[model samples]
Target: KLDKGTVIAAALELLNEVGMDSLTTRKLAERLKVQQPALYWHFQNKRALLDALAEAMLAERHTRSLPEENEDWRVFLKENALSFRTALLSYRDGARIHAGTRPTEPNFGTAETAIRFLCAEGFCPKRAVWALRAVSHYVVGSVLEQQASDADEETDGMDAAFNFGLDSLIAGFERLRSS
Candidate 1:
């Protein structure tokens, strides 16, 4: 017999295979060997299904030990950023899915952790919240940029591209410190 959990599992599997663009309730039903209406009974619409998938993905990726008390704030922040990037890139078009959807109940813990991290780094509460949002924005932007350049090639050209951007960012940071 088909169940809500079964339907969602099917949908997530399809999401990994076909990505967000081609995922559909009907397809999910087919995968679960159930009727479309059966799947719809669990999720009202595509947006709801996407929301559920986003929550599941976030839950899977959210690390509990982030922003450890003893770690340098800068290192902690960098690890958080990189972990977010890794999570978003794990699924097909995951970054695109994350960019379009808002976090719901399941993903709120990550956001709360980020805000606390900002506060720990000497930011006022208001500024901490703002910094959390800014970090999210930066990670989203950076992931989108990486997604756009999604090439499987491991040629030296790709390494060169990384070197170029890394050098520019480092130089820019140095310039900012001197000013």
Candidate 2:
């Protein structure tokens, strides 16, 4: 009787417990106490399942209102970077899960809109996607680095570290714009 939602919930729970490197669909099935291939029928493969996990983690951040039509593209791009980082940091292997898989529907819709907005702001579509990918890489790579760091010790400069790299990154993207 397990549906995709139930499958995703179990998968996320398992991820938070054991982290991504140790998780698998079989582990998911076992966790849910599911015994049917039909449950697996909902997803084509473990990647699909993981993508769903990422989508769920990201969906809430995407809920924030998108910027006004004339707002600086950096405004939204910054919001997305920070929001995604927050979402990823909340889970056990969340950065890996969020950045490890392909983007899913509706979740991708937010990303698409960001890129489109950038393109409308006068960056070429190719450059816009680059800007999008750059911000994503910065956020995920920053968090992943933190995740791999010692968890028992407090770092006085972690947020400042992210902000420094983040600001430098967006400046590159902002160069794509015209006055």
Candidate 3:
């Protein structure tokens, strides 16, 4: 049964062992004990399949659930960033998976949410784009840096270090409101 779900499941398992770069479709096909072209029926190529993995497997559930009660844009966004990072770190090469997820057309759903929230708080909708970008890039970059170091130990108190940067960006946004 080479359904799309089955193929993605096998690919995710292989991701845990091989990481992203080494995870070839041929390898996945071999793992499934099927011919190489069998995978092509579901996925045009490795990157296409990975895009599916990114949509379904990579932080899809986690980021969508922003806390309902917090109307304060800063707190809500901060929490969302944490959720995003935690979800990304949940799987192997999760950050890389997300960074490469939609290269052809970058999706802005998450950023749009942040921008709309900020707009309600008196921020110019246009500038909100860059503001959200700062936080998002920080979250993604920080997690990828941690994964790359592979220290097997906490480096610079990862959570605390993230706070330092997150707060700095939020403060800059605040400055924008006053000026």
Candidate 4:
């Protein structure tokens, strides 16, 4: 019998190979040497499976770390953005999958953790969440465009472009903090 994690593993491989549009439960089932009913057993529908697939991509360890005591907010946010970008770029259409989903249970506490870190940096609670959202949106959009561009060799200036936006966003946050 197929298990959840194993299905997610095969699904990710299929996603990398076929991308979201061309990816289908039938395709995944065929790739896994299993029948469609078993996949449906694990995932009620394709969207359910897609949500799980998105979560799995972001299940990377580094993305969940909070800042240490006295760590600079800029440093923490920069690293977080970098880690987030890496996770999305790990698979084809990774950002596409992530864009269509929302955060869920396991990430709730980490969301709180990230907000607390920003709050400690002197941001009010609302602003803290906004800052986090801003960084995440920036990262997602950057990766989406990067993936759309669709060639590793053409990625030469992409890193610099991403950091420029990242630095600009953080600088705005810093100004907001001081004001």
Candidate 5:
């Protein structure tokens, strides 16, 4: 009997080997040496499996620590942007996989808390969600471009560019505060 985690981990390995566009349940089952039905027992199809993969990738990220009391939101957002980028870059086509899904119910607690923190920090609830989504969109879009350039080539300017954009976005948020 294969556990869900075991299937997800194996699928991730296969994902890294073949990349997302080529990944199939048949290949995953072949890798696991199990029947395809076994996979469906845990996931209905490719999309469902990808959702779990995205969630697992996020589980490996270091964004759980909320900002300290009165810590500058700018600092927190910068750290968050970096951590999110790192997480998305860890797996093959990770940004692509993540782009296909949103956080499921399992993430509601942490998601709610983060949004509430932003709200308490002066953003209205709707704006807090918007702020979070904006950061996420920026992070995911950046990683997609980076990964698309070359899966294995080291880029000299990507990190610097990422920071430049991150700083600009945070500054824009700061301006929003004064208006």
Candidate 6:
């Protein structure tokens, strides 16, 4: 009896709880108190459900107002990158889900805006695209690193660990800029 929106909502809630790896059509059906066939009727397969889940997650966190261009380009880019990371970290396995999903959805508009910002920052078109992609890769890699380190109870705080790495990354970026 569940509508597609209701099913997608249940899937999103379960994603926040059990994460993407454990989510399945059957589990969604169970959560929605519907039959598995009903779930299939809505989504053709697991990938379809995941696509919906990804869109829902993006809409929930990323579909918001971006910062106005009051600051310099580098500051703007860095702040937007941090905001993207924050959005990804807000859900369970969110970074991984985002990495695996396609970016054709409307929620991916932030990424396009970010690339445009980079282009305005004196970067060439190719460099601007790559810069935005590099930021995404760095964020996803950092999130995965944090998740791996989460198993160690004695690990230092994320800020501390990031400081350890950020210096090197900044140095590299500077070198690239100068060269």
Which one is best on lDDT? Answer: 4
Top candidate (TM-score):
4
Candidate 5 residue 109 C-alpha distance from true site, Å: 1.9
lDDT of 5 by residue, 34-87 (tens): 999998899988888988999988886756436666777789888877888998
lDDT, residue 125, candidate 4? 90
Candidate 3: segments with Cα more than 4 A from true spot: 59-70, 100-110, 151-153, 177-179
Cα-based TM-score, every candidate: 0.75, 0.82, 0.82, 0.92, 0.91, 0.77
Superposed by TM-score, candidate 1 places the C-alpha of residue 173 at a distance from the truth, in angstroms, of 12
In candidate 2, what are the lDDT values of residues 29-145, reduced to their tens digit?
778887648656988776677777778887644444255656777777777678778888877767776775766566478667877788787888788877777777888888888
Per-residue lDDT of model 4, residues 1-179, tens digit only: 68899999999988988888898989999999998998899998888988998888888524635666677889889988888899889988888888857678867788899888777778899888888888988989999999988844356688888989999999899878534
Error of model 4, residue 130, in angstroms: 0.7
* Candidate 6 least-lDDT 10 residues: 170-179
Name the lDDT of candidate 4: 0.84
Deviating ranges (above 4 Å) for candidate 6: 63-67, 105-109, 151-156, 163-179
List the candidates ranked by TM-score, beginning with the highest: 4, 5, 3, 2, 6, 1
The better candidate by TM-score, 3 or 4, is: 4
Model 5 lowest lDDT segment of ten: 60-69
Full ranking by lDDT: 4, 5, 3, 2, 6, 1
List candidate 2 segments past 4 Å from native: 36-38, 62-65, 68-70, 150-154
Tens digit of per-residue lDDT, candidate 3, span 20-72: 88999789999999998889888887778777877665444466434365567
Which TM-score value belongs to model 5?
0.91
Compared with the true structure, model 6 gives a TM-score of 0.77
Q: Which scores higher on lDDT, 5 or 6?
A: 5
